[PDB]
Amino acid sequence: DDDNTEIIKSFKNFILEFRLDSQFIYRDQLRNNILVKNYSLTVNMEHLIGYNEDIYKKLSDEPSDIIPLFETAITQVAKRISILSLPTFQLILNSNANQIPLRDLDSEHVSKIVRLSGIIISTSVLSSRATYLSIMCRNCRHTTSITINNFNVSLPRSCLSNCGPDPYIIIHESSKFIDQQFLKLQEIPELVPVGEMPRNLTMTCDRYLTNKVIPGTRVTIVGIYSIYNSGVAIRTPYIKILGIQSMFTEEEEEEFLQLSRNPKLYEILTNSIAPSIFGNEDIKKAIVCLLMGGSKKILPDGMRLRGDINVLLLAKSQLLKFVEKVSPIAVYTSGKGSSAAGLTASVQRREFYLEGGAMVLADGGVVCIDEFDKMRDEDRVAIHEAMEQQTISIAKAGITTVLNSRTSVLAAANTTILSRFDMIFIVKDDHNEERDISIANHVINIHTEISIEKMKRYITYCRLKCAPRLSPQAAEKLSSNFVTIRKQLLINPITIRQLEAIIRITESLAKLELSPIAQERHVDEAIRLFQAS
Amino acid sequence: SLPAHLQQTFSPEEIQFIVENEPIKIFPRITTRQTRWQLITTDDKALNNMVAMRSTEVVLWIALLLKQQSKCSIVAPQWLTTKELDRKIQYEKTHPDRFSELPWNWLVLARILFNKAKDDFHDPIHELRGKIQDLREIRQIKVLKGLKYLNESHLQLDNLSLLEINELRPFITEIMDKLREIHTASLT
Amino acid sequence: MYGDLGNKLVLEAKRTKQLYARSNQDVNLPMYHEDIIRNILKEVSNLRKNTEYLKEQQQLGMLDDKVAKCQYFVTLLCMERNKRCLLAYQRLRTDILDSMAWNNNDTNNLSHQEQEYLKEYCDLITDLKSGDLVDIDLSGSLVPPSDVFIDVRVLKDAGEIQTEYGVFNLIKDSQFFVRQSDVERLIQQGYLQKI
Amino acid sequence: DAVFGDRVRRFQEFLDTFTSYRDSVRSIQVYNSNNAANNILPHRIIISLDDLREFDRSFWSGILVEPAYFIPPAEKALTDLADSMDDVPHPNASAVSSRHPWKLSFKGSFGAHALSPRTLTAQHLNKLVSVEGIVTKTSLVRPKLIRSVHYAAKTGRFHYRDYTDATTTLTTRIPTPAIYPTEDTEGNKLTTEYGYSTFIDHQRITVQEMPEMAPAGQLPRSIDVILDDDLVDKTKPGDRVNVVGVFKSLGAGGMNQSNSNTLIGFKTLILGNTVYPLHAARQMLTDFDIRNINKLSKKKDIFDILSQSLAPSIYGHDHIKKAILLMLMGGVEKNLENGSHLRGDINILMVGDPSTAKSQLLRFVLNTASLAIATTGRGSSGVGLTAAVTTRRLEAGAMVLADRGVVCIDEFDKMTDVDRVAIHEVMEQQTVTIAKAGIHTTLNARCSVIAAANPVFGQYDVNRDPHQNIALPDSLLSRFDLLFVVTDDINEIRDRSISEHVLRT
Amino acid sequence: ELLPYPHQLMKRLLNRISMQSQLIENISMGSKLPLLCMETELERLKFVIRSYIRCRLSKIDKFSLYLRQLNEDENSLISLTDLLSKDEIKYHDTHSLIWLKLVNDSILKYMPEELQAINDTEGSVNMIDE
Amino acid sequence: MGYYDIDDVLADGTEFPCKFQYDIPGLGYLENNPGRPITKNTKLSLPLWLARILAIVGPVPFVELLPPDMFSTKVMNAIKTDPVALDLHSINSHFFSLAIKWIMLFSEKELANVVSELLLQRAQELNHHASSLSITNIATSTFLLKLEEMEKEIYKKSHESYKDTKRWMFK
Amino acid sequence: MFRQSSEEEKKLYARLYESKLSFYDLPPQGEITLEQFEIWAIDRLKILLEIESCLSRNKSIKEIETIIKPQFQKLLPFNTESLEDRKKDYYSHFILRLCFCRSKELREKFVRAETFLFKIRFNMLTSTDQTKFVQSLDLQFISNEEKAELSHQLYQTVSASLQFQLNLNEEHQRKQYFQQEKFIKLPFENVIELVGNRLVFLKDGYAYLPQFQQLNLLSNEFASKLNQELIKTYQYLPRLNEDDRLLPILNHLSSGYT
Ligand SMILES: Nc1ncnc2c1ncn2[C@@H]1O[C@H](COP(=O)(O)OP(=O)(O)NP(=O)(O)O)[C@@H](O)[C@H]1O
Ligand SMILES: [Mg+2]
Ligand SMILES: [Zn+2]
Numbered sequence A: 001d002d003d004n005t006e007i008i009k010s011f012k013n014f015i016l017e018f019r020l021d022s023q024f025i026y027r028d029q030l031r032n033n034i035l036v037k038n039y040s041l042t043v044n045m046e047h048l049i050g051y052n053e054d055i056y057k058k059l060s061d062e063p064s065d066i067i068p069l070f071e072t073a074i075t076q077v078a079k080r081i082s083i084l085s086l087p088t089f090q091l092i093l094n095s096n097a098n099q100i101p102l103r104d105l106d107s108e109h110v111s112k113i114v115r116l117s118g119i120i121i122s123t124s125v126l127s128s129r130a131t132y133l134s135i136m137c138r139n140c141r142h143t144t145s146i147t148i149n150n151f152n153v154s155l156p157r158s159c160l161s162n163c164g165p166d167p168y169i170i171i172h173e174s175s176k177f178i179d180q181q182f183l184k185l186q187e188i189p190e191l192v193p194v195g196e197m198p199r200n201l202t203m204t205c206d207r208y209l210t211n212k213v214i215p216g217t218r219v220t221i222v223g224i225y226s227i228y229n230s231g232v233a234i235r236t237p238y239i240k241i242l243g244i245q246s247m248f249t250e251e252e253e254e255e256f257l258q259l260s261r262n263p264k265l266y267e268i269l270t271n272s273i274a275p276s277i278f279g280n281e282d283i284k285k286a287i288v289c290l291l292m293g294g295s296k297k298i299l300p301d302g303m304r305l306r307g308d309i310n311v312l313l314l315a316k317s318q319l320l321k322f323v324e325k326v327s328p329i330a331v332y333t334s335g336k337g338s339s340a341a342g343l344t345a346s347v348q349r350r351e352f353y354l355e356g357g358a359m360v361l362a363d364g365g366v367v368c369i370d371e372f373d374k375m376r377d378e379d380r381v382a383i384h385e386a387m388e389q390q391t392i393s394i395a396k397a398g399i400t401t402v403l404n405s406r407t408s409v410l411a412a413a414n415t416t417i418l419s420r421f422d423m424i425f426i427v428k429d430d431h432n433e434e435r436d437i438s439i440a441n442h443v444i445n446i447h448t449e450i451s452i453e454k455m456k457r458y459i460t461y462c463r464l465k466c467a468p469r470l471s472p473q474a475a476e477k478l479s480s481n482f483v484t485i486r487k488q489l490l491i492n493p494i495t496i497r498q499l500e501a502i503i504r505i506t507e508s509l510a511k512l513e514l515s516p517i518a519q520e521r522h523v524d525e526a527i528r529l530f531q532a533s
Numbered sequence B: 001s002l003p004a005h006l007q008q009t010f011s012p013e014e015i016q017f018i019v020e021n022e023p024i025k026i027f028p029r030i031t032t033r034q035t036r037w038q039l040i041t042t043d044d045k046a047l048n049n050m051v052a053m054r055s056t057e058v059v060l061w062i063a064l065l066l067k068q069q070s071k072c073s074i075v076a077p078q079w080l081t082t083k084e085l086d087r088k089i090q091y092e093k094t095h096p097d098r099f100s101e102l103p104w105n106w107l108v109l110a111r112i113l114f115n116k117a118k119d120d121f122h123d124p125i126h127e128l129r130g131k132i133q134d135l136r137e138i139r140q141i142k143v144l145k146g147l148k149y150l151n152e153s154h155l156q157l158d159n160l161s162l163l164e165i166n167e168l169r170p171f172i173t174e175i176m177d178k179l180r181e182i183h184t185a186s187l188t
Numbered sequence C: 001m002y003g004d005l006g007n008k009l010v011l012e013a014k015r016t017k018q019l020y021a022r023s024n025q026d027v028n029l030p031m032y033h034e035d036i037i038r039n040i041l042k043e044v045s046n047l048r049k050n051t052e053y054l055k056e057q058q059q060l061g062m063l064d065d066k067v068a069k070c071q072y073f074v075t076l077l078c079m080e081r082n083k084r085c086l087l088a089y090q091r092l093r094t095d096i097l098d099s100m101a102w103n104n105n106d107t108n109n110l111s112h113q114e115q116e117y118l119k120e121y122c123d124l125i126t127d128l129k130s131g132d133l134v135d136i137d138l139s140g141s142l143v144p145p146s147d148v149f150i151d152v153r154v155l156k157d158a159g160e161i162q163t164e165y166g167v168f169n170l171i172k173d174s175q176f177f178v179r180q181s182d183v184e185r186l187i188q189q190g191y192l193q194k195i
Numbered sequence D: 001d002a003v004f005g006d007r008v009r010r011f012q013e014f015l016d017t018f019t020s021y022r023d024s025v026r027s028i029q030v031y032n033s034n035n036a037a038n039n040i041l042p043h044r045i046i047i048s049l050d051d052l053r054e055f056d057r058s059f060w061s062g063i064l065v066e067p068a069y070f071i072p073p074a075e076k077a078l079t080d081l082a083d084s085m086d087d088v089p090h091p092n093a094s095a096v097s098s099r100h101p102w103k104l105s106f107k108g109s110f111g112a113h114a115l116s117p118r119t120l121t122a123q124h125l126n127k128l129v130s131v132e133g134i135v136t137k138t139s140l141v142r143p144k145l146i147r148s149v150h151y152a153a154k155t156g157r158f159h160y161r162d163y164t165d166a167t168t169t170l171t172t173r174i175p176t177p178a179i180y181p182t183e184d185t186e187g188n189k190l191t192t193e194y195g196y197s198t199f200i201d202h203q204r205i206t207v208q209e210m211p212e213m214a215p216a217g218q219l220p221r222s223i224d225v226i227l228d229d230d231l232v233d234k235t236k237p238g239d240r241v242n243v244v245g246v247f248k249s250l251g252a253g254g255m256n257q258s259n260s261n262t263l264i265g266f267k268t269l270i271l272g273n274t275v276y277p278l279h280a281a282r283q284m285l286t287d288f289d290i291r292n293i294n295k296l297s298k299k300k301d302i303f304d305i306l307s308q309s310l311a312p313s314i315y316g317h318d319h320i321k322k323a324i325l326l327m328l329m330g331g332v333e334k335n336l337e338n339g340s341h342l343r344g345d346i347n348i349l350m351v352g353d354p355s356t357a358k359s360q361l362l363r364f365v366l367n368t369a370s371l372a373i374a375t376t377g378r379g380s381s382g383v384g385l386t387a388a389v390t391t392r393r394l395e396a397g398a399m400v401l402a403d404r405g406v407v408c409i410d411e412f413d414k415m416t417d418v419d420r421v422a423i424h425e426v427m428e429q430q431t432v433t434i435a436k437a438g439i440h441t442t443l444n445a446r447c448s449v450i451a452a453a454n455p456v457f458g459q460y461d462v463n464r465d466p467h468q469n470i471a472l473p474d475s476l477l478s479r480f481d482l483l484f485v486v487t488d489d490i491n492e493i494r495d496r497s498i499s500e501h502v503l504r505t
Numbered sequence E: 001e002l003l004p005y006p007h008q009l010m011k012r013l014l015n016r017i018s019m020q021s022q023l024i025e026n027i028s029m030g031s032k033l034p035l036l037c038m039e040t041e042l043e044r045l046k047f048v049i050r051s052y053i054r055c056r057l058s059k060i061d062k063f064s065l066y067l068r069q070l071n072e073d074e075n076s077l078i079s080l081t082d083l084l085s086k087d088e089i090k091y092h093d094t095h096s097l098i099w100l101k102l103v104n105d106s107i108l109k110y111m112p113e114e115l116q117a118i119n120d121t122e123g124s125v126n127m128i129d130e
Numbered sequence F: 001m002g003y004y005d006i007d008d009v010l011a012d013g014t015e016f017p018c019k020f021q022y023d024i025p026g027l028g029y030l031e032n033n034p035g036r037p038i039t040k041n042t043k044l045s046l047p048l049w050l051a052r053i054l055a056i057v058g059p060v061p062f063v064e065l066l067p068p069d070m071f072s073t074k075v076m077n078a079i080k081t082d083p084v085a086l087d088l089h090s091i092n093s094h095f096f097s098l099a100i101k102w103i104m105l106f107s108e109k110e111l112a113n114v115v116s117e118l119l120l121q122r123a124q125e126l127n128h129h130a131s132s133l134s135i136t137n138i139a140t141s142t143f144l145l146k147l148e149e150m151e152k153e154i155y156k157k158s159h160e161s162y163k164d165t166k167r168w169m170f171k
Numbered sequence G: 001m002f003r004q005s006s007e008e009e010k011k012l013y014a015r016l017y018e019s020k021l022s023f024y025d026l027p028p029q030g031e032i033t034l035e036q037f038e039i040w041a042i043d044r045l046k047i048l049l050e051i052e053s054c055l056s057r058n059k060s061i062k063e064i065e066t067i068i069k070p071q072f073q074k075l076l077p078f079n080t081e082s083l084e085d086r087k088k089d090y091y092s093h094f095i096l097r098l099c100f101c102r103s104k105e106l107r108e109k110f111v112r113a114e115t116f117l118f119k120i121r122f123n124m125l126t127s128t129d130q131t132k133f134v135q136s137l138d139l140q141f142i143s144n145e146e147k148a149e150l151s152h153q154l155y156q157t158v159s160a161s162l163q164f165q166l167n168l169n170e171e172h173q174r175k176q177y178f179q180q181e182k183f184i185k186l187p188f189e190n191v192i193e194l195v196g197n198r199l200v201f202l203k204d205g206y207a208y209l210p211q212f213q214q215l216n217l218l219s220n221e222f223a224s225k226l227n228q229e230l231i232k233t234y235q236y237l238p239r240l241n242e243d244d245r246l247l248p249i250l251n252h253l254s255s256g257y258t
Helices: A003-017 A026-035 A046-051 A053-061 A063-080 A250-260 A265-272 A281-292 A316-326 A379-390 A418-419 A433-447 A450-463 A472-491 A497-514 A522-528 B012-019 B060-066 B080-095 B108-115 B127-146 B162-187 C004-022 C034-060 C062-102 C113-129 C180-189 D001-019 D020-037 D047-055 D057-065 D069-086 D285-294 D300-308 D318-329 D358-365 D382-386 D419-425 D491-504 E007-029 E033-063 E064-072 E086-108 F006-011 F029-030 F048-054 F075-080 F096-108 F110-131 F135-141 F148-169 G007-016 G033-054 G060-077 G083-100 G103-123 G126-136 G142-148 G152-167 G170-178 G188-196 G213-233 G247-255
Strands: A040-044 A092-094 A112-123 A129-130 A130-135 A143-147 A169-172 A175-186 A200-206 A219-226 A235-245 A311-313 A330-334 A345-349 A353-356 A367-371 A391-396 A399-404 A408-412 A424-425 B023-028 B055-059 B072-074 C151-152 C159-163 C168-169 C175-179 C192-194 D044-048 D105-108 D128-138 D142-152 D158-162 D188-192 D198-208 D222-228 D242-248 D267-277 D350-354 D373-376 D388-390 D393-396 D406-410 D431-436 D439-444 D448-453 D481-488 F015-019 F043-045 F061-065 G183-189 G201-203 G206-210
Touching: A003 A026, A003 A053, A003 A063, A026 A040, A026 A053, A026 A063, A026 B127, A026 F110, A040 A046, A046 A053, A053 A063, A063 A219, A112 A235, A130 A391, A219 A399, A250 A265, A250 A450, A250 C004, A265 A281, A265 A497, A281 A316, A281 A408, A281 A424, A281 A450, A281 B127, A281 G007, A316 A330, A316 A367, A316 A408, A316 A450, A330 G183, A345 A391, A353 A399, A353 D128, A379 A391, A379 A418, A379 C180, A391 A472, A391 D373, A391 D382, A399 B060, A399 D373, A399 E086, A408 D300, A433 G183, A472 A522, A472 D491, A497 A522, A497 D491, B012 B108, B012 B162, B012 F148, B023 B060, B055 B060, B060 B072, B060 B108, B060 E033, B080 B127, B108 B127, B108 B162, B127 B162, B162 F006, B162 F096, B162 F148, C004 C034, C004 C062, C034 C062, C034 D198, C062 C113, C062 E086, C062 F006, C062 F029, C062 F048, C113 C175, C151 C180, C175 C180, C180 C192, D001 D047, D001 D057, D001 D069, D020 D044, D020 D069, D044 D047, D047 D057, D047 F075, D057 D069, D057 D128, D069 D105, D105 D267, D128 D267, D158 G033, D300 D318, D318 D448, D318 D481, D318 G033, D358 D406, D358 D448, D373 D382, D382 D388, D382 D419, D382 G060, D388 D431, D393 D439, E007 E033, E033 E086, E064 E086, F006 F096, F015 F048, F029 F043, F043 F048, F048 F061, F048 F096, F075 F110, F096 F110, F096 F148, F110 F135, F110 F148, F148 G201, G033 G060, G033 G083, G033 G247, G060 G103, G083 G103, G083 G213, G103 G213, G142 G152, G152 G170, G152 G201, G152 G206, G183 G188
Parallel strands: A040 A092, A092 A235, A200 A235, A311 A408, A311 A424, A330 A367, A367 A408, D044 D105, D222 D267, D350 D448, D350 D481, D373 D406, D406 D448
Antiparallel strands: A112 A175, A112 A219, A129 A175, A130 A143, A130 A169, A175 A200, A219 A235, A345 A353, A391 A399, B023 B055, B023 B072, C151 C175, C151 C192, C159 C168, D128 D198, D128 D242, D142 D158, D142 D188, D142 D198, D198 D222, D242 D267, D388 D393, D431 D439, F015 F043, F015 F061, G183 G206, G201 G206
């Protein structure tokens, strides 16, 4: 009976007295946590060992029994430093003891503190556990209560106030609960013995340790290793977790603004794109416009005006990879697609279902296709809606839905399908031996202007800050040019769907300067670059 | 002209400078009584007329200057002892709104003497460092209750230390000013 | 409308204030917006032309009691709100320059009127610093003196240098035991650290 | 126990002070009492939670933080108010002991307790909350026993008893065995009086967070809701909805002896107190709207004003705009006395050159009609466009879903012949009928069809017959009321006008 | 507000500083510790005056037009020379001319004659702070 | 409320709804058409530095001010139920400046009583997050995204004050 | 810790109705109209006529409360902040003093009806208002030791009453309530109606009364003081005879009771 009080007294005196130099680090942490309504304390093992090794010995021998005593000691201190009501505080631990590989845990480790690491592969939804709980006695209608704590219980049968063999029921109307979550940990990929699939464990956490990690992340864990019921005299193992480890500034945009006022910025960005590829000036210019895009608009009668750009390329393999690297969001694929969804989408089967290809998945970003001629039959017809409407719509086998396809397409190949693109160009080659020798020397080196990340961040900044508008001079210029080309063709086609493409290119050119208005300077280069032919 | 962080307030360095002008009691280990000090902001007679192991009173900055070397020893103030600090904590607990009557420089002087003069105390220093903390924590509770009475007119405070006031100054004055602006705007 | 350019210009004042306040060591106030200011002044000139034309129509008798009064009055407000924006922006950059003048007593971002303004204010500071009250170094340190003697380590090879107290030889990564009142200026210049 | 009485008194003071709730009680009562002498309105009232705050903060926070202790006495007081007001005499046997009190509902300013299924957390248990999401599942409606009445054969005395279950009450009571008593305390054999007993309706649903809010492709989260009495069947799957109710827990949670080592948690629910839809179509007119509509109708040329106000961002094509307006108004549907039916709804087709705003104009109808479904001609099959079999259950297609609405079909020329012929019934008989293994049924499909297509040769050829340019059978073209041909004829002033227009746009 | 300058105190203090400096030099040219105390005391004294004068000049920057208007009012109950020291008077006067020249040429040269005043009270916003 | 104050300069440029009481020639540029008159009972959205005068100068003054959406009844009920949870930053970036200007303009009594309580109740949690110093980021960062531009300055000058004191003590 | 720091007639009636009921203790002041005098008197008279009619029909307190409570909002409002309602109530009572002081039969009828109305309105109060009203009237509880010594007798006396009047059917609930209940000691002659029904415990000429009972003492004090005030009112009726314009109204008011 007295041992429960001496242990609590000891951990209480630990928190009140541990100085390193001149700051009572655990008193300060416990106070600073309460002010932001965080009811927990993060103790470090090495400090506990330094203070008194006997306390650590008791904790190391019987953790399931002693962790609750230390938690209630924290509550008793929390009241003195803040009251002249609070829940029970959660204890959290940090440690540097030797990691055990997950594959070596065995019967020698049951009910011991264990430190390990791995990859999280799954996460459950949250669930409710009881801490303070109220009871009603069915016969006499007397009432009482119980206090649960979550360490390795059932309803009692000692009836009170004969009173019967099993008379107790729960008053959910006057009881207290906490959150609980389950996780799965898989052993590290670079540890697994050859020819075997990795082993994994299941584990539990509650209160502030919940909702702290997501699938696919590598983590380190401190927790009690134990067993639970679910052959003869045999039980399943698991872990109880006690700790886990895993927009612009002003000085950034000042650089982007200095770039914006450079008189040769257009040349600089074109030079910075796939610099190993010789020649092909207009290809690089078109990729800049594809990355920057026009401006989206919405009208009073609800009609909606597209912002994206689309380009086709007829050496060429390198540019799509470069675009994939520089773009803020990107998807890469070959014409057959990643599944029976193809490029656009399809219905599959047993009940029917639907899945989207690599037009739906790239929504909001850029998508690049590596051989557009290898497009499947259904995609040949479906890409018309995907490009003109920025949607895909299906009404088959009782499915009736519409999918978003808001993206800019880059494509390459080697017909009427060319009409869907804003610009089309044919890649050109040159055969200087020095270029191949330089490439070969670099290949041997690995076997034995603006940088990508800065350019990607700049493109992001420009897309977020500016969406410019045509000046009246540009309108007169464009309309005069439009009727001039149609008249020239008539005396010897251009159509509105291409005028509205020239406008988007013009806006994308003005966007580099961050000029809020587009000007004749941009219109001239737009029509100059329009020579796809 | 003046820095932005000194427009309305004193930094802790200036607070230390202000506290350093107070007198303190010392035991010198040398006799100066029959060159002479010839100071211009203080008395000069006390330093010129020292006798070894005879108690005397000087400004704190000179006292710390001497204690840097062998030549001097500093007597702790009488409030800075275990018995008195026990009584002040009991006063703090007994009267849940009043502040106990500690001197206006208690925090600053404690954290100067514990660094420069750890050897000259009679009590064990590891207990004083605990009781000072207890006092500061209780006073912080009482402060947090008081910030629910910021108003358009005024407030009264008692026995709150200089450093404790200076810690809170830019919050109290700002919120109080805006309540005043909102109220007077409705009168006009 | 006539206030849009002002509402755009003042955002640069707010931006440069926050950039300046974030890092006291990194003061380089940005390019003066000559083009926006010129556009605002051109707008004011347009409004002046409109008021002058309206005064001609008033002298012609074109319903001048009500019509000229209301149109003139409304135009006057549009001019005043532009004056306020321009003065606010220029006053902010002036405060920054005044702050630098006290420590210093490069030029390309300042407008030429500002370039002569800074020189004028430097002359004023040295006039105050000279003459009577010279005994206290008005451009010196504002942090109270804590210690007489300190230990300082040698960060940059400036070689042999002269100072009012004497001569120093700044042998890279040597260490001095010396009075602070001497080396305060060299610490501010950045040849030394306190360790 | 005594506190219950004082809470009833305090809510009575509220009901006397804010008089707009008395008018609500009385108006429902007089309406129900009128038509009973010849539909009936529910015994339910919605209170503004703001009025209660301004009346008494101590009662407001009590309702909002301890609903199990404040909602029952408040609801009791409402019933006393409605009962003391005058009511029809000589009630029938079933009316005398209905066990049917009035019920409350809430609106306005939930503050911190306005939530979503992802963020509902164990801290919020037993609080009154508001959640938002999409309905995903609904149970069948079931009746539930709450009271039964019995007649004792010898003594001539009518007896009764009441039943409870954990989802029927906010406060907690000993559960009841659902047994009917056969014999009296005094040994008399009993009989059960159905029709005097009381049963109520019950339905469970599930609500999930909206897909627009799902993070990182992670699994979405959801809650189950309990509905009863009046709230049953007011929703269907796919509805966006906002639900108000008490968040509560249930059951023994494995502490009644189980193999789980109590790792499993307790069960939880929301008890539906009020339900509101979300607009994501319909509007309700104010008096001023009726006045403006009637006044505008007396202009000399209302048809021109209205037609030109459709898609003003599209230049030209006056006649197609007028045709679309007449389609949106429609004819009048006739049913003759012998059961014979005559069609009322207008179908329109337009075929033409590339880029001539066909798809752009077709897109406008989808955003001004009250019910509209859109599809591309090659992305849809005959069965998917009309109806399909599943498991036997029969599942509706797009033309069955838009019943009294409009269906838009783009790229109509790409639809296969096998798909087109499924439409021949729907555009005249306005029904769908299936005769397949284990099924025979007829379904209703009354919509108007509007569609766009490309001519056979890629551009319209005036030097060949219209049948050569338009490859569709005569029996299908006959079903479209208006067939429009449109082309991109090159002309200077036309080009200039259109280009200047799009640039101004 | 800007409080009135202590004219007499400053004269006496600055004279005392000069005399103490010469005394320190004479004793230095003639135990170490007394010199230590004297030197650091003079540093402590000079710091306070430096801070005080910098604060007053900062107040004069912010209320320049207000002080000028207070001086121009012939009916004022206090003269500007009562409030400020001679050095402060020089700073106020010449700094006002420097600032005035900068805005007068840059902005106000372009404004119509009704809006060319810098210290206008009658406009839709008061141009004088206090 | 100083002349050269940037925040005051910037807050006066917010637009408020207005209605005219006279037809006037040539002022159609306010309606973005310089070639036309303004006509009586037309409604427009004008910046406060202009509407504050046209509502006063005469008699009947030229413009009448309509009750703006940022002082609507829904906002007042949101304020009075839970002031600490409220996202004032989304309602309007400069709320406590415009509130005082509107109070001066119409001499409102009840609005002043609502706004005083709102400020006093939010100052509490602002001090809590100011006092809490590391020896956490998410818990603080969620509330500090709902502060006005007015409140951010008070938070910054409080946090720096506590931090400087803490640094000096433990040194 | 931090720290900061005729109209008289209206204040009089605010004070008189802070308790929500009054013994009608004090002389009214200022003026009202003669139409108001007649109408206010008739309104209170209608309520008291219905109270006497129901009592002559031998109806219970609950039935009378169901009958009379809807009439307050029309004739004589209660639980109200309105100065007009408060003046109407106060003045109407004082007017009917002058109408019903005239004879022993009229005094008895008026005292009976007004005391029953007092009982009704007291039942409408919250327990806090009842406590404050009783405390405002300057109205001996026994010691805990005396309660312990007499606990068996007191519990035997009140146990049935706790079950029937407070619905405490469980003996456990009765014991808990009795442990929390206070008792009053006074001479048995003061509560003789409870004595005749054996609802109080008697010892040495003193009756022991639980706190949840004893409202009959309050209403009896109201009735007794009203009777004495009516006797006084009767003695100075010759001063009422100086304004003739009031006597027809008072004759009309009394005629409905004769
Ligand atoms: N007045 C107009 N006349 C013609 N086209 C216009 C007009 N105004 C805009 N457009 C544009 O014309 C383009 C093509 O319109 P759209 O409706 O897709 O043509 P379409 O008839 O569907 N051509 P298609 O998809 O090849 O069958 C869009 O980008 C419209 O914005
Ligand atoms: Mg199209
Ligand atoms: Zn029992």
